[PDB]
RNA sequence: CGUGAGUGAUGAAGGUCUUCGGAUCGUAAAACUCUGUUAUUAGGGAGAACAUAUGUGCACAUCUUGACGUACCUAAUCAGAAAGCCACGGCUAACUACGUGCCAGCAGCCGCGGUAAUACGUAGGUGGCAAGCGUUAUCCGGAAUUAUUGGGCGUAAAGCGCGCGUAGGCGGUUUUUUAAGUCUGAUGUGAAAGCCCACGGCUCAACCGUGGAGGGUCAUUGGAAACUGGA
């Protein structure tokens, strides 16, 4: 949806969490123009905007397309501060990042056709799938065994919580309740819980 | 007297700055429990009983620490004549969840803020002198 | 033991009788690694002896910054000079980033729940003076309770 | 759905800055496999719901329809193309060579033009964002700025020279009053393109029941007087 390089997400933002090594062959200093100079200090509203831009490259849906995402991480009752990390893992990228189909989120959004999609009935080729207690995000009859669906079947052993994945199946249908602290913590919570409100 | 607690607010505050153990607040007809509403906690310490004659003068009996430490860091006026700060069932405030006693008078005379939400009423506490 | 933040060492091209005198004004934040701001400037020929010079001559310009339950007690401002700041509360278990003004003010207050705010300009001589203006004008829980002189749960 | 890479030769035939030092527009890349999600003909088919022998007290029988008739989609798996315009020394996330050289450009803030303006114009570009991009008039971030939270009674934003007088705006009078008053009282009602505590789906859009809950009610004295200006 960004149609650009996916290597500037760990340079303009301060929370990428998409790859292990990225500053090994790059230059982990400051920005681009003044990359050989010193760094700065994120502003009050800037830190909440930097995280939004940091999640802008991470989340497939950008400004206006992620309406539900922001709407579910604000008005929704519960821990408003940690509502951006709780009610935001209901996408189709989580299933691919828990079964072993795509290591990135952008590739996980395009893995809703090449990889497992048939979630025990009606499927969805969007970046977010309605996986609830009863949906088994699996593959189709003709696309039972794919190349991107059965790529890292043995390379990705450790799986995440509230997710299921096996050999020649990769059907997620475990717990429906997820963790609100089972995600990277680099951005502020109350800051985004107030700024968004406005 | 134009302001009921005019000298009252300019006495304890001044006595809590120059460290005045005994105070001389001009007692009136409602200047008794209004200057001793914090007798439950320890803000204005406590007193035996307002003793004078037809609105004469009332003491506050302020107490300090070893090196004269004031518990109150300056007292300002809030509920005065003219406007009315009646706290109904709108929204009751909270900070440390229970500590001292304030200005919440209804039909029980002088009560604390512990049951302020229970009664859901917010008035001004007052009392006569002797 | 003490989080000393040496931002930069402003130099000067003195055009006096001497060819080119070099005066390095090493700038270092005099923080006590707790929640105080701290700011001192030196003027010695040796930066190391100049950084400590302002840390031993200016270490009482700090201000005690308490915390409620892991969130800024009050969103204060800063009206001292050109450069200004702002206190934005966040969740106790969070973090900070880069991009804006000074970073040695909320970083000293190990809480990871405050966002350092200071637009004004880039001049780092009138932007840190506004940060201490709001830090000293901060509103605490009991601090405001004494202002009214009633109960702590009667002014919220 | 959104338009091709499961794969992948310094991925060049030599150029992008090149003091050529390497990297690369370049895990761009060949030429296929791949990726399905383009056709090829297709037969297709809620506001508003009960009827028409003469056999039937706000109930109903032989016999009452079309101006139509191709979302999400994992499927045929032809090959149907996210480009763009802008700042680039910047302010403000952004550039290299030439060509210019107060000629022209640039031109909110800056300013850059009388020589070495990567600020100019072309090429290789870069930061942004999203099927596009620069423009014109219209609220609020900007910031309290007739100050209201948000004005002084002096330099600031502030000395009516007017010395003699009731604008009812307002300036101790003890006690003292018959109840100006602070918190109780008829409550049925308590509805609402109303923030409805939930309530329905249209993937990207308009698919709407809950009047008691439900606040957005519709118990706050008749009342306890030693008290704004007036004793």
XYZ file of C-alpha atoms (C1' of nucleotides) in Angstrom:
715
model
C 0.000 0.000 0.000
C 3.088 2.250 0.520
C 4.647 1.230 -2.858
C 8.229 2.079 -1.743
C 11.457 0.741 -0.146
C 10.831 -1.347 3.035
C 14.314 -0.488 4.454
C 13.544 3.130 5.545
C 11.113 1.844 8.248
C 14.094 1.348 10.643
C 15.638 4.770 9.754
C 12.746 7.320 9.856
C 10.961 5.461 12.725
C 12.357 4.284 16.108
C 10.383 0.987 16.334
C 10.631 -1.340 13.269
C 10.519 -4.882 14.802
C 10.315 -6.434 11.278
C 13.861 -7.857 10.850
C 16.765 -9.105 13.039
C 19.767 -7.453 11.293
C 19.250 -4.122 9.445
C 21.862 -1.682 10.893
C 24.647 -4.308 10.415
C 25.326 -3.370 6.737
C 23.636 0.077 7.108
C 24.595 3.109 9.290
C 22.785 3.212 12.697
C 23.521 6.922 13.450
C 20.782 9.601 13.083
C 18.519 10.472 10.080
C 19.478 10.857 6.373
C 20.400 14.492 5.524
C 22.359 14.990 8.808
C 23.180 11.251 9.167
C 26.804 12.023 10.197
C 25.599 14.580 12.825
C 24.014 13.991 16.292
C 20.424 12.714 16.889
C 17.515 14.699 18.398
C 14.795 14.132 21.067
C 11.224 13.137 19.981
C 8.668 15.917 20.786
C 5.508 15.335 22.933
C 3.151 15.246 19.882
C 6.098 14.165 17.666
C 6.660 10.907 19.627
C 2.945 9.992 19.141
C 3.240 10.958 15.416
C 6.575 9.066 15.021
C 4.936 5.862 16.400
C 1.981 6.426 13.992
C 4.504 6.749 11.095
C 6.442 3.763 12.578
C 3.209 1.663 12.509
C 2.335 3.256 9.105
C 5.132 1.164 7.472
C 4.318 -1.861 9.716
C 0.479 -1.932 9.354
C -0.801 -2.438 5.766
C -3.739 0.006 6.174
C -2.418 3.630 6.172
C -4.165 6.936 7.121
C -8.021 6.544 6.647
C -7.730 2.864 5.443
C -6.920 1.803 9.066
C -10.078 3.578 10.391
C -11.291 0.416 12.240
C -7.739 -0.163 13.633
C -7.642 3.363 15.196
C -11.400 3.177 16.046
C -10.813 -0.174 17.880
C -7.786 1.383 19.682
C -9.713 4.392 21.100
C -13.514 4.326 21.695
C -13.353 0.551 22.490
C -13.731 0.054 26.297
C -10.720 -1.339 28.237
C -7.017 -0.382 28.678
C -7.142 2.652 26.295
C -3.346 3.134 26.671
C -2.559 -0.469 25.581
C -5.593 -0.573 23.199
C -3.237 0.134 20.229
C -1.409 -3.192 20.907
C -4.497 -5.181 22.107
C -7.292 -4.412 19.564
C -4.921 -4.288 16.523
C -3.689 -7.927 16.238
C -6.917 -9.014 14.431
C -5.230 -8.685 10.978
C -4.391 -11.525 8.506
C -0.631 -10.829 9.017
C -0.754 -12.261 12.589
C -1.838 -15.726 11.264
C 1.136 -15.707 8.796
C 3.435 -14.398 11.605
C 2.302 -17.240 13.950
C 2.025 -20.257 11.563
C 5.208 -19.591 9.509
C 4.206 -18.127 6.099
C 5.620 -14.544 6.051
C 8.222 -12.979 8.429
C 7.121 -9.424 7.417
C 3.656 -7.739 7.621
C 3.624 -6.369 4.016
C 4.374 -9.917 2.703
C 1.768 -11.319 5.168
C -0.908 -9.052 3.564
C 0.005 -10.539 0.123
C 0.042 -14.068 1.685
C -3.820 -14.113 1.832
C -3.927 -15.818 -1.627
C -0.544 -17.586 -2.174
C -0.609 -18.991 1.404
C -3.352 -20.371 3.718
C -6.535 -18.204 3.406
C -9.635 -20.490 3.645
C -10.409 -19.774 7.362
C -12.723 -22.830 7.819
C -15.308 -21.605 5.248
C -15.358 -18.094 3.685
C -11.801 -16.744 3.052
C -10.557 -13.101 2.712
C -7.793 -11.565 0.503
C -7.556 -8.423 2.738
C -4.829 -7.444 5.287
C -7.178 -8.331 8.215
C -9.143 -11.615 8.685
C -12.105 -12.298 11.053
C -10.328 -15.086 13.052
C -12.457 -15.693 16.211
C -13.094 -18.740 18.493
C -14.335 -21.081 15.704
C -12.425 -19.885 12.591
C -9.593 -22.166 11.305
C -7.416 -20.006 8.956
C -6.278 -22.920 6.700
C -5.665 -23.469 2.925
C -8.089 -24.403 0.074
C -8.626 -27.810 -1.650
C -6.558 -26.912 -4.779
C -4.123 -24.679 -2.790
C -3.787 -27.299 0.021
C 0.037 -27.491 -0.452
C 1.541 -24.139 -1.622
C 5.192 -22.928 -1.894
C 4.814 -19.736 0.248
C 2.305 -21.544 2.562
C 4.662 -24.532 3.229
C 7.925 -22.512 2.849
C 9.297 -22.357 6.449
C 7.226 -25.337 7.771
C 10.344 -26.600 9.657
C 12.326 -23.284 9.589
C 9.677 -21.648 11.865
C 9.423 -24.027 14.890
C 8.549 -21.601 17.756
C 4.950 -20.334 17.166
C 3.093 -17.424 18.887
C 0.236 -17.663 21.470
C -3.461 -17.948 20.403
C -2.393 -19.551 17.065
C -2.157 -23.073 15.511
C 0.036 -24.508 12.680
C 0.959 -28.113 11.677
C 2.525 -29.999 8.705
C 0.393 -30.006 5.488
C -2.350 -27.993 7.305
C -1.233 -24.638 8.853
C -4.777 -24.078 10.267
C -4.957 -21.515 13.128
C -7.884 -22.097 15.551
C -6.496 -21.971 19.147
C -7.418 -19.394 21.869
C -9.327 -16.253 20.700
C -8.160 -14.069 23.656
C -4.672 -12.576 22.953
C -2.071 -10.730 25.123
C -1.945 -6.876 25.175
C 1.779 -7.027 26.168
C 2.832 -9.713 23.609
C 4.080 -7.051 21.112
C 7.110 -4.677 20.851
C 6.992 -1.836 23.450
C 8.920 1.206 22.068
C 6.069 3.770 21.595
C 4.054 5.517 24.380
C 0.541 4.234 25.313
C -1.272 7.079 27.150
C 0.314 9.507 24.601
C -1.532 7.726 21.709
C -4.591 7.205 24.012
C -4.926 11.030 24.399
C -3.572 12.424 21.066
C -5.992 10.190 19.067
C -8.929 11.374 21.265
C -8.182 15.103 20.595
C -17.991 42.762 57.475
C -18.104 42.497 53.630
C -16.442 39.020 53.469
C -17.424 36.358 56.100
C -14.026 34.515 56.115
C -12.094 37.681 55.072
C -9.709 37.790 58.099
C -10.119 33.987 58.610
C -8.207 33.263 55.334
C -5.691 36.083 56.118
C -5.027 34.645 59.637
C -4.274 30.857 59.502
C -2.310 31.342 56.218
C -0.290 34.204 57.831
C -0.014 32.202 61.112
C 1.205 29.130 59.123
C 3.957 31.296 57.506
C 5.223 33.167 60.639
C 4.606 29.979 62.742
C 1.816 31.234 65.094
C 0.786 28.411 67.516
C -2.285 30.356 68.805
C -4.454 32.248 66.239
C -7.006 35.109 66.664
C -9.619 34.698 63.857
C -12.618 37.091 64.346
C -15.340 34.539 65.310
C -18.826 35.186 63.800
C -22.120 33.207 63.493
C -20.771 30.784 60.805
C -17.002 31.293 61.473
C -16.480 28.191 63.708
C -16.613 24.802 61.868
C -15.645 26.563 58.568
C -12.201 27.378 60.090
C -12.004 23.942 61.830
C -13.424 21.616 59.092
C -9.977 19.900 58.850
C -10.094 18.855 62.561
C -10.575 15.185 61.478
C -7.208 14.799 59.637
C -4.578 17.288 60.930
C -4.347 20.119 58.341
C -5.549 22.776 60.869
C -4.711 20.435 63.820
C -7.671 20.726 66.269
C -9.216 22.914 69.051
C -11.193 22.258 72.295
C -14.314 24.420 71.612
C -14.933 28.009 70.342
C -15.272 29.989 73.632
C -16.165 33.742 73.501
C -19.366 35.889 73.410
C -21.686 37.017 70.526
C -19.129 36.630 67.647
C -15.937 37.803 69.441
C -12.840 35.843 68.251
C -11.910 32.134 67.739
C -8.447 30.436 67.865
C -7.119 27.703 65.488
C -4.351 26.206 67.726
C -1.855 25.484 64.880
C 0.975 22.935 65.503
C 4.342 22.535 63.666
C 7.323 20.109 63.612
C 10.722 20.153 65.407
C 12.247 22.710 62.955
C 8.838 24.476 62.488
C 7.442 22.381 59.565
C 4.067 23.640 58.187
C 1.778 20.799 56.921
C -0.299 23.357 54.904
C 1.603 25.041 52.003
C -0.610 28.183 51.867
C -4.449 28.164 52.047
C -6.484 29.906 49.273
C -10.226 30.830 49.098
C -12.634 28.740 46.916
C -16.256 28.666 48.238
C -17.049 32.327 49.156
C -20.248 34.501 49.069
C -22.066 35.137 45.740
C -21.400 31.967 43.673
C -22.347 28.454 44.953
C -20.186 25.291 44.463
C -22.922 22.644 45.056
C -21.517 19.180 44.141
C -24.567 16.993 43.253
C -24.504 13.611 41.410
C -22.443 15.142 38.531
C -18.871 13.917 39.313
C -17.031 13.708 42.696
C -13.227 14.416 42.632
C -10.497 12.030 43.953
C -6.670 12.180 44.437
C -5.248 9.921 47.221
C -8.606 8.103 47.841
C -9.321 9.177 51.473
C -7.063 11.197 53.851
C -8.612 14.365 55.389
C -12.096 15.983 55.726
C -13.558 18.865 53.619
C -16.606 21.095 52.889
C -19.614 18.742 52.249
C -22.625 19.753 54.436
C -26.235 18.558 53.797
C -28.782 17.645 56.541
C -26.305 15.804 58.853
C -24.464 19.019 59.883
C -20.660 18.528 59.546
C -19.716 15.193 57.842
C -16.478 13.927 56.169
C -15.891 13.259 52.416
C -15.549 9.487 53.135
C -19.342 9.097 52.562
C -19.545 12.224 50.326
C -20.330 10.009 47.269
C -22.631 7.806 49.443
C -24.826 10.882 50.213
C -24.046 12.376 46.728
C -24.343 15.962 48.164
C -21.727 18.780 48.290
C -22.541 21.826 50.469
C -20.639 24.259 52.757
C -19.992 23.291 56.441
C -20.699 26.061 59.040
C -21.365 26.362 62.825
C -22.245 28.987 65.511
C -19.686 30.336 68.071
C -20.394 29.341 71.735
C 25.983 7.283 39.915
C 25.071 10.585 38.142
C 23.559 10.785 34.604
C 25.625 13.716 33.181
C 24.399 14.649 29.646
C 27.127 16.612 27.746
C 25.096 17.889 24.712
C 27.893 19.778 22.849
C 30.949 22.083 23.357
C 30.124 25.487 21.735
C 33.408 26.977 20.370
C 34.209 30.692 19.688
C 36.482 32.277 17.013
C 37.753 35.188 19.203
C 39.000 37.969 16.827
C 41.103 39.795 19.513
C 44.855 40.799 19.398
C 45.845 37.073 19.529
C 45.831 35.120 16.212
C 42.808 32.906 17.074
C 42.060 32.190 20.789
C 40.085 28.912 21.267
C 37.417 28.986 24.049
C 35.321 25.758 24.279
C 32.108 26.275 26.344
C 31.431 22.560 27.104
C 27.636 22.212 27.698
C 26.600 19.395 30.128
C 23.232 18.711 31.890
C 23.720 18.543 35.721
C 21.146 15.734 36.250
C 21.082 13.638 39.471
C 19.765 10.544 37.574
C 16.327 10.616 39.321
C 13.952 13.287 37.903
C 15.800 16.651 38.114
C 16.666 18.648 34.923
C 20.142 20.212 35.583
C 22.000 22.626 33.237
C 25.540 24.109 33.434
C 27.961 25.753 30.941
C 31.787 25.939 31.281
C 34.440 28.237 29.709
C 37.803 26.478 30.365
C 40.487 25.460 27.794
C 40.015 21.804 28.924
C 36.445 20.503 28.211
C 36.773 17.743 30.907
C 37.852 20.351 33.539
C 35.188 22.761 32.147
C 32.294 20.203 32.136
C 32.852 19.472 35.881
C 33.487 23.230 36.470
C 29.779 23.987 35.746
C 28.731 20.742 37.561
C 30.412 21.943 40.817
C 29.360 25.623 40.381
C 25.784 24.933 39.127
C 24.222 21.796 40.740
C 21.426 23.520 42.761
C 19.442 24.619 39.640
C 17.664 21.197 39.554
C 13.986 20.634 40.594
C 12.365 17.577 42.313
C 9.896 15.935 39.837
C 7.632 13.368 41.641
C 5.437 10.735 39.874
C 1.789 9.710 40.625
C 1.375 6.049 39.484
C 3.653 6.097 36.386
C 2.051 9.132 34.648
C 2.922 12.898 34.675
C 0.922 14.535 37.557
C -0.024 17.562 35.358
C 0.603 18.586 31.692
C 2.667 21.781 32.406
C 4.105 24.295 29.848
C 7.221 26.562 29.725
C 7.079 30.364 29.164
C 10.777 31.281 29.787
C 12.600 32.886 26.812
C 12.091 31.879 23.138
C 12.396 28.044 23.180
C 9.426 26.450 25.028
C 8.527 22.876 26.195
C 5.462 20.751 27.201
C 4.830 17.752 29.543
C 2.851 14.942 27.791
C 1.883 11.901 29.977
C 2.315 8.273 28.737
C 1.979 4.715 30.176
C 4.603 3.690 32.828
C 5.802 0.756 30.647
C 6.676 2.656 27.419
C 9.660 4.542 25.897
C 10.984 7.679 24.084
C 12.314 8.390 20.522
C 14.451 11.061 18.738
C 13.604 14.167 16.634
C 12.987 17.636 18.196
C 14.833 19.570 21.001
C 16.859 18.652 24.173
C 16.708 15.041 25.527
C 18.302 15.541 28.988
C 15.150 16.487 31.016
C 12.598 13.599 30.929
C 15.407 11.036 30.311
C 16.856 11.997 33.752
C 13.445 11.139 35.316
C 13.693 7.332 34.838
C 9.934 6.658 34.345
C 9.615 6.061 30.543
C 6.132 7.719 30.534
C 6.902 11.419 29.737
C 7.367 12.996 26.250
C 9.959 15.851 26.136
C 8.365 18.881 24.352
C 10.219 22.119 23.355
C 9.478 23.928 20.030
C 10.678 27.575 20.283
C 13.972 27.352 18.317
C 17.279 25.379 18.111
C 19.142 27.814 20.457
C 20.014 25.574 23.490
C 20.383 28.531 25.951
C 16.743 29.770 26.261
C 14.977 26.417 25.559
C 16.206 24.625 28.754
C 15.324 27.698 30.908
C 11.625 27.247 29.937
C 11.796 23.520 30.901
C 12.724 24.491 34.523
C 9.951 27.170 34.440
C 7.291 24.449 33.930
C 9.061 21.849 36.130
C 8.955 24.358 39.058
C 5.339 25.268 38.069
C 4.359 21.538 38.082
C 1.167 20.597 40.032
C 1.476 17.615 42.458
C -1.318 15.577 44.151
C -0.825 16.942 47.714
C 0.813 20.204 46.444
C -2.622 21.246 45.013
C -4.472 19.659 47.988
C -2.807 22.193 50.367
C -3.796 25.070 47.996
C -7.489 24.416 48.877
C -6.768 23.147 52.434
C -9.431 20.380 52.547
C -9.049 16.735 51.363
C -6.863 15.213 48.562
C -9.992 13.492 47.099
C -12.002 16.789 47.049
C -10.079 18.673 44.285
C -10.211 16.487 41.110
C -9.890 -8.121 -6.008
C -6.237 -3.585 -6.806
C -1.677 -5.576 -13.095
C 3.618 -11.206 -13.026
C 8.004 -12.920 -10.596
C 8.057 -19.936 -6.835
C 13.234 -19.043 -9.272
C 17.325 -15.920 -10.213
C 24.760 -15.017 -13.713
C 28.250 -7.296 -11.182
C 22.162 -8.865 -12.480
C 25.155 -6.705 -18.359
C 26.108 -4.705 -23.710
C 29.536 0.234 -18.744
C 27.039 3.904 -17.580
C 24.795 6.727 -12.409
C 28.947 11.197 -8.805
C 33.407 8.872 -10.429
C 40.157 12.579 -6.939
C 37.355 6.018 -11.410
C 38.050 3.390 -4.499
C 33.955 0.656 -4.499
C 29.248 -0.170 -4.419
C 25.300 0.174 -7.895
C 19.144 2.937 -11.324
C 21.000 -3.425 -9.829
C 18.666 -10.144 -5.061
C 16.581 -4.020 -11.317
C 18.034 -7.977 -14.123
C 18.096 -12.744 -18.127
C 13.962 -16.597 -19.869
C 11.393 -18.910 -18.322
C 8.909 -20.851 -14.460
C 5.874 -18.190 -11.440
C 2.118 -15.562 -9.483
C -4.733 -15.322 -10.561
C -7.730 -11.848 -8.912
C -7.882 -9.925 -17.251
C -11.345 -12.754 -21.274
C -13.910 -17.160 -23.929
C -18.946 -18.073 -24.629
C -22.478 -18.792 -21.575
C -28.341 -21.035 -19.911
C -28.721 -17.743 -15.674
C -33.042 -14.408 -12.481
C -38.281 -3.995 3.231
C -39.941 1.792 4.072
C -43.888 -2.095 1.211
C -47.020 -7.683 1.639
C -52.891 -10.047 2.611
C -56.666 -10.876 -0.985
C -60.040 -11.964 -7.004
C -66.141 -19.472 -7.354
C -69.654 -16.405 -4.101
C -68.396 -21.234 0.855
C -66.187 -17.261 4.901
C -66.179 -11.172 11.527
C -58.691 -5.451 12.391
C -59.256 -12.456 10.397
C -60.083 -13.897 4.160
C -60.939 -19.109 -1.136
C -61.268 -21.084 -8.443
C -58.543 -16.722 -9.722
C -53.981 -10.883 -8.487
C -45.776 -9.601 -10.644
C -41.493 -7.039 -13.111
C -38.258 -0.332 -16.854
C -33.820 -5.421 -14.422
C -32.907 -11.074 -14.891
C -22.191 -9.252 -13.556
C -19.759 -7.441 -4.403
C -16.050 -9.652 -1.017
C -14.562 -13.271 -4.878
C -8.433 -17.929 -3.820
C -11.423 -20.046 -11.142
C -10.962 -20.290 -15.369
C -5.022 -19.249 -14.136
C -5.073 -14.584 -21.220
C -1.070 -10.971 -19.228
C -5.013 -6.274 -18.592
C 0.415 -1.981 -15.118
C 0.770 3.245 -8.894
C 2.387 6.341 -11.415
C 3.189 10.901 -9.923
C 4.059 15.900 -8.653
C 6.203 18.795 -5.188
C 10.849 20.941 -0.857
C 15.736 19.665 -1.641
C 21.208 25.282 1.429
C 17.211 25.016 4.128
C 13.433 26.251 7.372
C 10.993 20.858 7.415
C 11.585 14.224 6.949
C 15.148 15.878 1.024
C 21.380 16.308 -4.671
C 24.750 15.175 -7.906
C 27.142 16.672 -12.314
C 26.878 20.459 -16.354
C 24.123 25.361 -18.136
C 23.774 29.637 -16.063
C 26.053 34.011 -13.983
C 20.917 41.398 -10.746
C 20.151 38.490 -18.070
C 16.339 34.835 -16.717
C 15.074 31.389 -13.027
C 14.082 30.573 -8.170
C 10.807 33.226 -5.277
C 4.889 31.420 2.328
C 9.558 31.641 5.782
C 13.928 32.620 4.058
C 16.281 34.487 0.183
C 19.292 32.672 -3.615
C 21.073 36.419 -9.343
C 27.111 41.739 -10.382
C 31.010 34.172 -11.411
C 32.476 29.523 -8.972
C 22.992 30.798 -6.809
C 23.168 21.170 -6.729
C 17.937 27.643 -4.291
C 18.454 28.698 -10.974
C 17.547 25.072 -15.874
C 18.206 20.327 -17.890
C 19.755 15.029 -17.120
C 21.006 10.760 -12.451
C 18.355 11.593 -8.337
C 16.488 12.159 -3.038
C 11.966 13.108 1.705
C 6.783 12.822 1.706
C 2.455 10.592 0.872
C -0.990 8.283 -1.682
C -4.078 6.220 -8.833
C -2.681 11.348 -9.368
C -0.707 16.294 -8.709
C 0.481 21.872 -8.091
C -3.477 25.982 -7.645
C -7.820 29.829 -5.818
C -11.654 31.808 -2.100
C -14.009 29.435 3.088
C -13.496 27.234 10.365
C -10.128 25.988 13.807
C -2.844 23.870 15.212
C -0.974 28.075 15.284
C -1.120 31.718 20.490
C -5.914 34.247 23.741
C -5.339 38.407 20.674
C -11.768 43.879 24.651
C -8.803 39.048 28.295
C -14.035 35.284 29.416
C -10.110 31.022 32.294
C -7.868 35.407 28.473
C -6.772 43.123 31.088
C -3.767 47.293 34.157
C -5.189 50.650 37.906
C 3.298 53.257 37.198
C 8.216 52.225 32.244
C 5.169 47.485 29.552
C -1.061 46.985 27.802
C -2.287 51.886 31.132
C -1.463 58.613 35.251
C -9.415 61.695 34.073
C -4.604 68.805 35.477
C -11.060 68.742 35.939
C -8.974 69.591 43.882
C -16.514 71.105 45.139
C -21.145 67.272 44.356
C -26.487 60.886 44.769
C -24.653 56.942 37.684
C -28.170 53.119 43.157
C -22.584 50.244 40.163
C -21.597 50.096 44.766
C -18.825 52.263 50.863
C -17.687 48.647 59.888
C -22.389 50.316 62.635
C -23.094 45.724 68.655
C -27.714 43.452 69.796
C -31.656 42.457 66.856
C -36.150 40.327 62.582
C -41.619 37.491 61.388
C -37.865 32.136 57.836
C -34.168 36.400 50.549
C -31.249 31.153 52.195
C -27.173 26.347 51.253
C -29.483 20.344 51.921
C -34.558 16.652 52.133
C -40.683 17.568 49.397
C -46.076 15.556 45.069
C -42.703 11.560 40.337
C -46.782 10.057 36.979
C -42.890 11.241 33.307
C -38.313 9.390 32.709
C -39.021 10.083 24.370
C -35.853 11.487 21.063
C -31.123 12.395 12.474
C -29.934 12.725 21.358
C -23.257 9.659 22.598
C -28.056 4.061 23.368
C -25.259 0.215 28.527
C -25.461 -3.486 23.992
C -27.963 -3.856 20.008
C -27.280 -5.606 11.700
C -25.077 -6.977 7.509
C -23.466 -5.097 3.268
C -15.110 -6.672 3.003
C -13.918 -0.377 0.999
C -21.264 2.020 0.980
C -27.206 3.684 2.434
C -28.950 -1.239 4.358
C -32.218 -0.431 12.131
C -36.086 -3.020 16.557
C -34.932 -1.883 22.220
C -39.531 4.595 25.155
C -39.648 0.737 31.775
C -33.466 0.153 31.699
C -31.784 5.330 29.556
C -28.895 9.222 31.787
C -30.561 13.639 27.679
C -35.983 12.610 34.870
C -40.103 15.315 35.526
C -37.645 14.560 44.784
C -33.158 19.135 46.062
C -37.696 21.992 51.077
C -43.191 24.454 53.306
C -37.795 24.794 55.364
C -32.746 25.907 60.309
C -31.889 33.760 60.078
C -27.210 36.460 65.870
C -25.882 38.210 57.944
C -23.690 42.036 49.923
C -24.911 48.838 49.348
C -29.750 50.032 53.175
C -29.553 49.758 61.128
